[PDB]
């Protein structure tokens, strides 16, 4: 009933994307809440937040996150000029999504050490169309499904290692899945 | 001893420096060598084989105490194509793969290694000044003793399209770069 796309719900921006593989139900709830239920999904990512995001937003989230297989829960966003995709990963399922990415260093924020990484995406889908761009990762060592993310600590850590922010695009708390099943119910503020 | 190559107590050795001063390379009994350095320039030296092989299992043991920029590695070259390579087992204050292009990961001898390549442009080499690629495997679990199955690295590199030519020397080496330290390493 909610199809892949973007828009606003109950005051919050939301984005939902899938590869058309079937097996994902994304729902928007009251306020900053969204749920995802999935079963033998393909690749998807969806959630609530802001458009545009900012370089110093403190993002609060709370709820339940129950992946069965490949999945992660993150602050997810994009920047323009240069085109950048980024993830501050708060929890993941059966696969560490930083695997294969180049480690850049570490940062401490909001009660955990994070490992930071970058990888190059070549001719991949993006907010401006097929493109080659860098994808930044900050992966929390102490997994959780509630908390507060001071995005500035991660942007500062990435910038130390090559990141430049031109103009911010969207910035959401998102659940990603990749050929897996699960449920999640997350509220953003 | 002075910068050069040779054999000592059954082992090939190579010692190179940039002329800056501040480093002593010493050959010891059997497969042992030591390095002591203090405000050095750039150097690399150690013991092993000439030529090395693409399936050698290399054993090293001892003490490695860098104070600054340094690494401990299986170090060697191939010819045709000219390739310089490092399987880095430990390092000091700087990750020598910094800025190199990551090609993948390989698990070997008790650790995940990150695999990289970079290009050296008009740089010193075993055949003179040249431009050539440099392959890296960098151990995540740092150690100063252990066993290196070189085939696991060479095969992983090949899978990422990193061809090796005819093998030249292959040693366990201590490198330093504008730093101080001591090391005592025995190869077998």
């Amino acid at each position: 009933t909610i199809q892949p796309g973007t828009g606003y719900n109950n005051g919050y921006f939301y984005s939902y994307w899938n590869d058309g593989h079937g097996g994902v139900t994304y729902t928007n709830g009251p306020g900053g809440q969204f749920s995802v239920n999935w079963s033998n999904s393909g690749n998807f990512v969806g959630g609530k937040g802001w458009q545009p995001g900012t370089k110093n937003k403190v993002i609060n989230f709370s709820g339940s996150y129950n992946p069965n297989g490949n999945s992660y829960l993150s602050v997810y966003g994009w920047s323009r000029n240069p085109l950048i995709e980024y993830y501050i990963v708060e929890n993941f399922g059966t696969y560490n999504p930083s695997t294969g990415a180049t480690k850049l260093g570490e940062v401490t924020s909001d009660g955990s050490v994070y490992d930071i990484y970058r990888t190059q995406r070549v001719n991949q889908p993006s907010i401006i169309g097929t493109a080659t761009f860098y994808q930044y990762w900050s992966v929390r060592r102490n997994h959780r499904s509630s908390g507060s993310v001071n995005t500035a600590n991660h942007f500062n850590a990435w910038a130390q290692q090559g990141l430049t922010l031109g103009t911010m695009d969207y910035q959401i708390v998102a659940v990603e899945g990749y050929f897996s099943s699960g449920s999640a119910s997350i509220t953003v503020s």
Side-chain angles (χ1 to χ4, degrees), chain A residues 2 12 24 26 32-33 59 70 74 89 94 97 106 110 129 137 143-144:
Chain A
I2 130 101
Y12 287 86
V24 185
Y26 175 90
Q33 195 275 355
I59 296 178
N70 214 318
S74 64
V89 179
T94 50
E106 306 176 0
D110 305 295
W137 297 88
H143 297 179
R144 58 180 194 173

Side-chain angles (χ1 to χ4, degrees), chain A residues 4-23:
Chain A
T6 65
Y8 279 78
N9 175 260
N10 296 318
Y12 287 86
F13 175 80
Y14 78 88
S15 177
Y16 169 49
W17 178 92
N18 71 45
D19 58 5
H21 192 250

Side-chain angles (χ1 to χ4, degrees), chain A residues 101-122:
Chain A
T102 302
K103 184 169 178 182
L104 300 180
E106 306 176 0
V107 64
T108 299
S109 187
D110 305 295
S112 184
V113 177
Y114 288 71
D115 294 289
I116 59 157
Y117 312 79
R118 177 179 58 223
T119 184
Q120 182 177 62
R121 310 294 298 154
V122 175

Side-chain angles (χ1 to χ4, degrees), chain A residues 175-189:
Chain A
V175 172
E176 179 268 12
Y178 187 87
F179 297 85
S180 64
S181 301
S183 60
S185 177
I186 301 293
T187 301
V188 191
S189 62

